[PDB]
Design a protein around this nucleic acid. Sequence first.
RNA 1: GGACAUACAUAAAGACCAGGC
Length: 139
Amino acid sequence: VDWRDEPEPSACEQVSWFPECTTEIPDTQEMSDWMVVGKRKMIIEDETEFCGEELLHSVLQCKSVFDVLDGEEMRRARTRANPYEMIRGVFFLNRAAMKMANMDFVFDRMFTNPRDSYGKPLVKDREAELLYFADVCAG
RNA sequence: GGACAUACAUAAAGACCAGGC
């Protein structure tokens, strides 16, 4: 695997979206048979329905190369190899806060300043309205 | 995937003996 043919590390991130869902929202009658119960599968190597077999086997092999390695040796190499590792948490309690800071920039402040379909802010700091949010599995 | 034991303290006790006023 030639890893040296990687694009120069950048603070500029690109977003590709799914198309806009043109189908109706599935109802209770449409979904009535959608829940298939089968044998408990604990195999990931044959899950090729949405990824080419050669890429799936290659990423699984590249993961399992680390199973024989000391975790502190892996962690030290990773800290040198990741161009973004010096960001960390800055002044926040952990590096997860910086993921939300990054994504709230990349997604046009849609979380910290959400908008209606006409592009108007749903919360104005001078009016009696609060930005309600939830944070789950988030300790 | 830090200390002045500034604890001045070796003072045996006990005894007899010698001298001082």
